[PDB]
Curated annotation (Swiss-Prot), chains A, B, C, D, E, F, G, H, I, J:
Native source organism of the sequence: Homo sapiens (Human)
Binding site for Cu cation: 6
Residues bearing the modification Phosphoserine: 43
Biological process terms in GO annotation: adult locomotory behavior; amyloid fibril formation; behavioral response to cocaine; cellular response to copper ion; cellular response to epinephrine stimulus; cellular response to fibroblast growth factor stimulus; cellular response to oxidative stress; chemical synaptic transmission
Covered residues, full protein: 45 to 99 of 140
Protein name in UniProt: Alpha-synuclein
């Protein structure tokens, strides 16, 4: 076989899960957050996949 | 077989899940948030997939 | 087989779920948010798939 | 076989999971956060995959 | 076979899991955080994969 | 002060919430159920406060 | 002060929450259930407060 | 002070939370269940407070 | 002071939390369950407070 | 002071937490379970407080 990509690719066979991202956010997984009190200014309480590039 | 992509592709066979994103947000997964009190200015309480690029 | 894409594609066979996004938001998954009090100015309380690019 | 990529690629066969990211965040895994009180200004309470590049 | 990449690639066969990242965050693994009280200003309580490059 | 009860009482001062039950069911709290498919004969899918005393 | 009860009482002062139960079920708390598929005959999927006394 | 109870009592002062139960179930706490597939006959998937006295 | 109980009592002062139970189940605490697949016949997957007295 | 109990009592002063149980189950504590696959017939996967007296 032959393949040429510029990116971003994701090429496969017999594949149970696939995610391609440029951005941005993708949530595909099981996630449970239980929480009782959030205070403070300002605290990232429960972050799973996170990116902060403030300018 | 032969394939040429510019991106972003996602090419496959026999594949249970697929996500392609440029952006942007995609939520395809099970997610449960239970929460009782959020305060503060300003706190990211429960973030799963998150991207902040303020300018 | 043969395939040429410019992107963004999502090409497959025998595939249970598919999402293609450029944007933008796509919500296809099970999601439960239970919440009791949100305060503060301004706090992202419960974000699942999120993108903030304010200029 | 033959392959030429510019990146970022992810090329495979017989592959159970795949993630390609440029960004950005991708959450595909099981995650449980249970939490009772978050205070302080400002404390990253529970971070799993995290990136902070404030300027 | 032949392959030329610019990076970042991830090329394989018969491969159960794959992650490619430039960024950014990717969470694909099982993760359980149980927590009772977070205080202080400001303390990284429970960080799994973490990167802080404040300027 | 003086108090004599037979039960079931609930006596208080300065009290934000109160529930008295003999029965029976009382639902006063925030509750979110999101659900996609229920099958089987017969499975209690998502029960929060539950009592089964079949004879 | 003086108090005589037969039960079940709940006597207090300056008290934020109160529940008295004989039964029966009382749900006063924040609860989030997100769920995608329930099968089997018969499986208690997600039970929070539960009592089964079949005869 | 003086107190005589038969039970079940719960007597207090300056008390943030109170639960009295004979039964029966009481759910007053924050609870998040996220779940993707339940099978089998019959498996208690996620039980928090649970009592089974089948005869 | 003087007190005579038959049980079950719970007598206190200046007390943040109280639970009295005869039964039965009481859930007052923060709880997060994230789960991806439950199979088998029949397996207690995730039990927190649990009592099984089948006859 | 004077006290006579039959049991089960729990008598105190200046006390942050209290639990009295006859039964039965009480869950008051922070608990996080993250889980990816449960199989087998039948395996107690993750048990925190547990009692099995099958007859
Ligand atoms: C036990 C056993 C199993 C198999 C076997 C099982 C499954 C299977 N393919 N399954 C598929 C497939 C596809 C699915 C697809 S798709 O077609 O890709 O689209 C989709 C989807 S879905 O997304 O819609 O959910 C699926 N669910 C698919 C799926 O489930 C296959 C192929 C095979 C095979 C063998 C097997 N057991 N073999 C032996 C063989 C020998 C055994 C021997 S002996 O000494 O050799 O006589 C003895 C003993 S004993 O001492 O313990 O009694 C045994 N137990 C022996 C034994 O068990
Ligand atoms: C037990 C056993 C199973 C199979 C087997 C099972 C499934 C299967 N394909 N399943 C598919 C497929 C497709 C689905 C598709 S699609 O077509 O892709 O669109 C879609 C969808 S859906 O999205 O609509 O849900 C699906 N659900 C699909 C799906 O479920 C296949 C192919 C096979 C095979 C074998 C098998 N057991 N074999 C043996 C073989 C031998 C055994 C032996 S022996 O020593 O060899 O005599 C002994 C013993 S014993 O000692 O334990 O009694 C055994 N148990 C033995 C035994 O079990
Ligand atoms: C148990 C067993 C099963 C199969 C098997 C099962 C399913 C199947 N295909 N299923 C499909 C398919 C398609 C669906 C499609 S579609 O067509 O793709 O559009 C759509 C949809 S939907 O979206 O509308 O829901 C579906 N639901 C589809 C679906 O469900 C297939 C293909 C197969 C096969 C074998 C099998 N068991 N085989 C053996 C084989 C041997 C066994 C042996 S022996 O030693 O070899 O004699 C012994 C023993 S024992 O000791 O335990 O008694 C056994 N149990 C043995 C045994 O079980
Ligand atoms: C900072 C500070 C606060 C207090 C204080 C605060 C609150 C308060 N009572 N609050 C209540 C009450 C009731 C509510 C009721 S109810 O009436 O029960 O029905 C209901 C409800 S509601 O259900 O409707 O929501 C409420 N929300 C109620 C409520 O909020 C009270 C009583 C007090 C007190 C003091 C205080 N700070 N004192 C000092 C004292 C000294 C300080 C000193 S010094 O060395 O001693 O000079 C220095 C410094 S510095 O170096 O940091 O500048 C300080 N910061 C100092 C300082 O902060
Ligand atoms: C820092 C400091 C604090 C206190 C203090 C703080 C709180 C307080 N009572 N709080 C209550 C109370 C009730 C609440 C109630 S209720 O009334 O029971 O219903 C309800 C509820 S609620 O359920 O509605 O949420 C509440 N939230 C209640 C609550 O918050 C009290 C009583 C006190 C006291 C002192 C204090 N600091 N003292 C000193 C004292 C000296 C210090 C000295 S010195 O050498 O002695 O000059 C030096 C220095 S320095 O070198 O670091 O600058 C200091 N920092 C010094 C200092 O900090
Ligand atoms: C900082 C400080 C605080 C207090 C203080 C704070 C709170 C308070 N009572 N709060 C209550 C109460 C009731 C609430 C009620 S209820 O009335 O029970 O119904 C209800 C409810 S609600 O359910 O509706 O939400 C509430 N929220 C209630 C509540 O919040 C009280 C009583 C006190 C007290 C002192 C205090 N700080 N003192 C000092 C004292 C000295 C300090 C000194 S010095 O060396 O001694 O000069 C130095 C320094 S420095 O070096 O750091 O500048 C200090 N910081 C010093 C200092 O901080």
């Amino acid at each position: 076989k032959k393949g040429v990509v510029h990116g971003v690719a994701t090429v496969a066979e017999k594949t149970k899960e696939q995610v391609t991202n440029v951005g941005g956010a993708v949530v595909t997984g099981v996630t449970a957050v239980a929480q009782k009190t959030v205070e403070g200014a300002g605290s990232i309480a429960a972050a799973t996949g996170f990116v902060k590039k403030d300018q």
